[PDB]
User: Fold Na, K-ATPase alpha subunit from Squalus acanthias.
Amino acid sequence: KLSLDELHNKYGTDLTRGLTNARAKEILARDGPNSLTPPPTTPEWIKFCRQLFGGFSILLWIGAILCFLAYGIQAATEDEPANDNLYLGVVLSTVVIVTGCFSYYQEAKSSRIMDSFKNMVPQQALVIRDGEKSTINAEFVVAGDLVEVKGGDRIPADLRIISAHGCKVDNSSLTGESEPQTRSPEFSSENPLETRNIAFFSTNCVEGTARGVVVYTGDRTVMGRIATLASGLEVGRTPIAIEIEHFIHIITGVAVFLGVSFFILSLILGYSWLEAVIFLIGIIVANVPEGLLATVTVCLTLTAKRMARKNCLVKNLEAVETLGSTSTICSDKTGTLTQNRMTVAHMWFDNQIHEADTTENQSGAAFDKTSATWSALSRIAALCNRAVFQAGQDNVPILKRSVAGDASESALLKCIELCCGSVQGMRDRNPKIVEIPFNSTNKYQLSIHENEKSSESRYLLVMKGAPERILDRCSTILLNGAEEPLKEDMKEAFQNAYLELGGLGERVLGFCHFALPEDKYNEGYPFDADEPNFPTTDLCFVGLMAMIDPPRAAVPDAVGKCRSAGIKVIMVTGDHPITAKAIAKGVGIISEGNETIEDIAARLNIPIGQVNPRDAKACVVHGSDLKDLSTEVLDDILHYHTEIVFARTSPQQKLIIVEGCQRQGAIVAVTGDGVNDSPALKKADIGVAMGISGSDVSKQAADMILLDDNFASIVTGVEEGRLIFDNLKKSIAYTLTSNIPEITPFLVFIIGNVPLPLGTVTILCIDLGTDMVPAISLAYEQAESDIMKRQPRNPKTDKLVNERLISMAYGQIGMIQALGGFFSYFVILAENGFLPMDLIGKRVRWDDRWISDVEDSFGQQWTYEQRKIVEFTCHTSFFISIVVVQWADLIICKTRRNSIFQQGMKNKILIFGLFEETALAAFLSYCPGTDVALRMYPLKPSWWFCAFPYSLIIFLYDEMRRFIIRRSPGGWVEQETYY
Ligand SMILES: C=C(/C=C\C[C@@H](O)[C@@H](O)[C@H](O)C/C=C/C=C\[C@@H](O)C[C@@H]1O[C@H](C[C@@H](O)[C@H](O)C[C@H]2O[C@H]([C@H](O)[C@H](O)CC[C@H](O)/C=C/[C@H](C)[C@@H](O)C[C@]3(O)O[C@H](C[C@@H](O)CCCCCCC[C@@]45C[C@@H](C)C[C@@](C)(O4)[C@@H](C[C@@H](C)CCCCC[C@@H](O)[C@H](O)[C@H](O)[C@@H](O)[C@H](O)[C@H]4O[C@H](C[C@H](O)[C@H](O)/C(C)=C/[C@H](O)C[C@@H](C)[C@H](O)C(=O)N/C=C/C(=O)NCCCO)[C@H](O)[C@@H](O)[C@@H]4O)O5)[C@H](O)[C@@H](O)[C@H]3O)C[C@@H](O)[C@@H]2O)[C@@H](O)[C@H](O)[C@H]1O)CC[C@H](O)[C@@H](O)[C@H](O)[C@H](C)C[C@H]1O[C@H](/C=C\[C@@H](O)[C@H](O)C[C@@H]2C[C@@H]3C[C@H](O2)[C@@H](CC[C@H]2O[C@H](CN)C[C@H]2O)O3)[C@@H](O)[C@H](O)[C@H]1O
Ligand SMILES: CCCCCCCC/C=C\CCCCCCCC(=O)OC[C@H](COP(=O)(O)OCC[N+](C)(C)C)OC(=O)CCCCCCC/C=C\CCCCCCCC
Ligand SMILES: CCCCCCCC/C=C\CCCCCCCC(=O)OC[C@H](COP(=O)(O)OCC[N+](C)(C)C)OC(=O)CCCCCCC/C=C\CCCCCCCC
Ligand SMILES: CCCCCCCC/C=C\CCCCCCCC(=O)OC[C@H](COP(=O)(O)OCC[N+](C)(C)C)OC(=O)CCCCCCC/C=C\CCCCCCCC
Ligand SMILES: CCCCCCCC/C=C\CCCCCCCC(=O)OC[C@H](COP(=O)(O)OCC[N+](C)(C)C)OC(=O)CCCCCCC/C=C\CCCCCCCC
Ligand SMILES: CCCCCCCC/C=C\CCCCCCCC(=O)OC[C@H](COP(=O)(O)OCC[N+](C)(C)C)OC(=O)CCCCCCC/C=C\CCCCCCCC
Ligand SMILES: CCCCCCCC/C=C\CCCCCCCC(=O)OC[C@H](COP(=O)(O)OCC[N+](C)(C)C)OC(=O)CCCCCCC/C=C\CCCCCCCC
Ligand SMILES: CC(C)CCC[C@@H](C)[C@H]1CC[C@H]2[C@@H]3CC=C4C[C@@H](O)CC[C@]4(C)[C@H]3CC[C@]12C
Ligand SMILES: CC(C)CCC[C@@H](C)[C@H]1CC[C@H]2[C@@H]3CC=C4C[C@@H](O)CC[C@]4(C)[C@H]3CC[C@]12C
Ligand SMILES: CC(C)CCC[C@@H](C)[C@H]1CC[C@H]2[C@@H]3CC=C4C[C@@H](O)CC[C@]4(C)[C@H]3CC[C@]12C
Ligand SMILES: Nc1ncnc2c1ncn2[C@@H]1O[C@H](COP(=O)(O)OP(=O)(O)O)[C@@H](O)[C@H]1O
Ligand SMILES: [Mg+2]
Ligand code: NA
Ligand code: NA
Ligand code: NA
Ligand code: NA
Assistant:
């Protein structure tokens, strides 16, 4: 409740010139940037407690405790003790600590990449300083400068409106509004939230433009004080995540069951009540998989960084998953399929077609520049146009300089300045009284100006728009200079002119004008843009103007890739069916051979109504028909046609098309740029907002932001989206297989009563060696040459962890790695004197420190450490047999449909993994001192080879398993083993 003078007098500011740059910076440095402050958080404290002290590591923390107590009771009691317990503790503790560090290096990394994408797409406001308009980062606005807003932009700070032009804002988020409340410079209510002279932070200007003085800036804002609570914030979990958990749950159920069973088995065989619970605890711990979620989050984060490099920024991680399943792409034409770099090619007037483009000069012998009709046409183009040359281009040529405005008005303005002269004087020659702006629902632009004829003081009215609309507003024709009527002979010549200019892939516009009678509208009468002050019809059409706009380079290949993937492409444009059909013919939306109902009518020379609608695979639906249609008809066109093009369509229509596409049961992505798109951009599954030309509304409302506005960028993004899935399945498949060889020894040991084949140190060696680096390498895998040549996926029918993964890992591949390790075990014992038949039952006697007389097969007598040494030589051999079989499992994991001979060994990280593991096994087995500390003994050379036959069998099996897939689709193998 103040005035414009009191406001400018309190903060200090010129209503017509704004602040000065020096003063602006003085205030910018005086009170801090216009950005909210970060909220409270848990530091590394709660970050490390969850890592080193979580749920699975806790058990290891116990193993370490127990062992230390085992050493203390020893050194305090027994003279000259042993040290296997002290080094066991020193080894276990080091494992919990490392696992924690690795996980930390991963949790942070993701938290940081997401923060980077927030500054990729910042917000830049429009401020007026020293009398000039400039777009600066929202973080540089201060209190006092002048700020201008336009329908589609976001209010930067708390403004005090000083001048508005039918400006409306969306005040729903702060409070609870719905409809657009209009912002007027006058004051209306005592409550600041109800008055219209104040713009607010985080609000958006729906329609109109306005000016205002920044009253409040930075945290000193309404939503800033409210943010006390906001600080917390909220996030989410992708589908995949709630898929993994589910799995984990089932497995836990299977694991708990088996535990109780192993319990009854132990007691029916005479174990100690305590030994049965020790077994239940161990078995349930060995059946539940560990790591699944960390690898899912890391894989997604890494893929997003891959996508932002290829021009596709994702507002969240759920978008990374939805992009792959994409079935339909509803794309627009001017901006996506094209470049918006249009240029006038053919002009129509005096029933004649005229060419142009006088090579940045006055040559080309286009048309007499003297033509009267041409003077009228050149004048309306130069007058109704709203664009203007960017300041300071007095040096560059007429075609290469910079302009501000629609691409249509820019092509028009340049043609008129090259072969027609300076527009600023042409614009002052005639004074602009009242102007009405363009719109997609109107489809025309009009304005009235004074007439510079010093002998005629009348009023001139000019309007341009889609040639069809303008034709319906004319009853005369400016012909050869005079006027004539629009009868059918020239009406048909005009129709054949639309197809001549249209088939050329050119954009066409209509231009007409009329002399308002100064007797019914005097020089003093003001024609406010409210009611019918101008005769819409009875105008004088002067002539058409056509311009070319080419498609992007990569676009033809993109549509081809979509067709091979099993993806439908739809073009939604505001132009004419001819230009639509054409662009479609070029990009590839409408491939060769397919015809429409009109094409068949033309070939057969039969009425269009007689032709069968099912006979045509492709169709071009207009807008009037779409408005008149119900729902079953829409489903008919969407289901029966393969290539559907939509021409002449308002924005309020897009939603009907999207609802039709979802009714079928398909995932859709839509490309949007304005305000009327926000509704559509929310209902669809993937909202693609333009980065270059979009508005704050389109970006806030969508899931993704296209950085280059290229249709080609998208298809590449979907390729990146499918690869995530493929690699995730491969990695999980590689991780779950080692579970079988680690559990089978503890089973035969208890049931069959033989010496323990795998122990605690060796098992930890397997998990950390063959499951960490090789697994990570898999993420980096390339794409098989089938990724785009395969149908999309139905999330309901196809899941990540299904009953087939467990079939290949546990059942087929696993059991083989187990047999491979059992051979190296049997071989080591038989050679050292203990044969296989004699081994069943020796455990009871084997594990007794007191029987130094153990007798072997050849009849020799063994002490306690002499036989324990051979057992340890078996733990080490098992280990190596596992790395050897892992070689094979890893190679076969690279591809699931193609061979490795086809895919190739170009992955460097995977190789690194093979050589490094081999090195770890050779190093630990041969180093001089592991004996004392880790309990691994040297392996003789004839032993390393025991696992080789089992490693070749796995590779050959998977190779054939695949050949049969490639040859017989939908067969038994694909139904059963394709995960
Ligand atoms: C950290 C862990 C925890 C521990 C770790 C541990 O290892 C180590 O840290 C150590 O702790 C280190 C700690 C050291 C601490 C300190 C030390 O430093 C210091 C030194 O320690 C030394 C000790 C140390 O030297 C020791 O030796 C260490 C070992 O300890 C364990 C030993 O074995 C054993 O404990 C020895 C100790 C002693 O023996 C204990 C005895 C009992 C306590 C108790 O009985 C004695 C006594 O009686 O207790 C009394 C107290 C009472 O209140 C208690 C109340 C009793 C309740 C009764 C109810 C029972 C119950 C319960 C019901 C639920 C069900 C039910 C059926 O039974 C039901 C039925 C009722 C109706 C029964 C009623 C019975 C009544 C009984 C009671 O009344 C009492 O007995 C009674 O009151 C008594 O007083 C009385 O005397 C009674 O006597 C008799 C009773 C009978 O005896 C008794 O009842 C009997 C027999 C029952 C029998 O079951 C009956 C059967 C026959 C049956 O009925 C039968 O007939 N069947 C006939 C069938 C038949 O015909 N069939 C014919 C078929 C025809 O068709 C009599 O009968 C009764 O009448 C009479 O009343 O109710 C009281 O105090 C006294 O009385 C006392 O004497 C073993 C270990 O713990 C340890 O090694 C000390 O000597 C020394 O002085 C000290 O200085 C977690 C574990 C790990 O997770 C796991 O890995 C684990 O490590 C492995 C499993 C190890 C195994 O493998 C190792 C090698 C490698 C492994 O590590 C590998 O890692 C394995 C892994 C595992 C998994 C899988 C896989 O493999 C791998 C995969 C993982 C991979 O996947 C991953 C992915 N996620 C990635 C990767 O990791 O992980 C091996 O080395 C291990 O050896 C091996 O085990
Ligand atoms: C829980 C999941 C486990 C997964 C794999 C577990 C691997 C376990 C494999 C073996 C462990 C059992 C212990 C074997 C010891 C049995 C000894 C035996 O058997 O002594 C019989 C013969 C020895 O004859 P000799 O020459 O000394 O007699 C000479 C006679 N004179 C001279 C008088 C003419 O030994 C033979 O013939 C060959 C016997 C050698 C081993 C055969 C064991 C059974 C056969 C295949 C097992 C693999 C099954 C795979 C299943 C996949 C799904 C689970
Ligand atoms: C010290 C340790 C050394 C370890 C040595 C390991 C050796 C390897 C072990 C076994 C190898 C045999 C496995 C054969 C399995 C069948 C593979 C198969 O059927 O692949 C089919 C592919 C055809 O694909 P496509 O036409 O659909 O591609 C289309 C591409 N697009 C789309 C671009 C046109 O064929 C191809 O890629 C052509 C590739 C041909 C490769 C032939 C290899 C066989 C030669 C000897 C094998 C060893 C025999 C016994 C050895 C005992 C050794 C001591
Ligand atoms: C004694 C018996 C033992 C039996 C044990 C069995 C062990 C496991 C059995 C087999 C596993 C090894 C199989 C190796 C496969 C070689 C396949 C190959 O050669 O396919 C030729 C490729 C294709 O080329 P392209 O241009 O047509 O592809 C065009 C690709 N598109 C279309 C996408 C552009 O060419 C390329 O990949 C480029 C050249 C890559 C050369 C890779 C050489 C390294 C191979 C293995 C490394 C050793 C690891 C073990 C470490 C332990 C050592 C101590
Ligand atoms: C990637 C992760 C996968 C695997 C991770 C495994 C984590 C394990 C972490 C730590 C384990 C530490 C083990 C400590 C090594 C032994 C220390 C020790 O407690 O030794 C005690 C022995 C004394 O035995 P004694 O007197 O009873 O023997 C009597 C012999 N009689 C009587 C027959 C003559 O000491 C001796 O023998 C003297 C020999 C000293 C041995 C020097 C070897 C250096 C050890 C590690 C350095 C290697 C790092 C790798 C760098 C790679 C660079 C590219
Ligand atoms: C481009 C870069 C490629 C890199 C590939 C991987 C690099 C491989 C690196 C090293 C491998 C060579 C190992 C040579 C070691 C010989 C040392 C030796 O003196 O050893 C003697 C033993 C005989 O022991 P004994 O029990 O009779 O006497 C024991 C007598 N006492 C115990 C009383 C002393 O003999 C043995 O260990 C035999 C040793 C094994 C023989 C090698 C056979 C493999 C040959 C080629 C396969 C290479 C894979 C490439 C595949 C490419 C496919 C596209
Ligand atoms: C140390 C040893 C190292 C080497 C070991 C090598 C072991 C690997 C050997 C073979 C791999 C076994 C893969 C198992 C898959 C067989 C499944 C099968 O039965 O699938 C038959 C399919 C039928 O599909 P469908 O759609 O008509 O079914 C319609 C079904 N309904 C009517 C119900 C809808 O395909 C057909 O019938 C026609 C296709 C038949 C393909 C036969 C492939 C034989 C290839 C190699 C075997 C020879 C190895 C020689 C080595 C000598 C070693 C001593
Ligand atoms: C699920 C996990 C964490 C439970 C671990 C239980 C541990 C603490 C239990 C399992 C078996 C127990 C041992 C069983 C037998 C004996 C022998 C006795 O003369 C001293 C205690 C001692 C050595 C016990 C100490 C505690 C012990 C090691
Ligand atoms: C350690 C040993 C004894 C365990 C042996 C486990 C074997 C028998 C288990 C491991 C994985 C299991 C398979 C997992 C999935 C399926 C698919 C289902 O539609 C039919 C059963 C089938 C094919 C299972 C059969 C039994 C199976 C092969
Ligand atoms: C392609 C297929 C059929 C070939 C199978 C070859 C079999 C028979 C070969 C492959 C590796 C071989 C083993 C390699 C190493 C040793 C250690 C030695 O001290 C005793 C023999 C023994 C245990 C061999 C026995 C025969 C063996 C198992
Ligand atoms: N400034 C303008 N004034 C009048 N008509 C225009 C203007 N710009 C474009 N047109 C024409 O009006 C119609 C509506 O265009 P629009 O809704 O933007 O569709 P598109 O997205 O295909 O350009 C098109 O035929 C277009 O050629
Ligand atoms: Mg558009
Ligand atoms: Na693990
Ligand atoms: Na959405
Ligand atoms: Na594996
Ligand atoms: Na594992």
Summary: Residues 941-942 surround 1,2-dioleoyl-SN-glycero-3-phosphocholine (ligand 6) (CB under 6 Å). The chain has four domains: 1-33+113-232, 50-103+233-326+712-979, 327-339+551-711, 340-550. The radius of gyration is 38 Å.
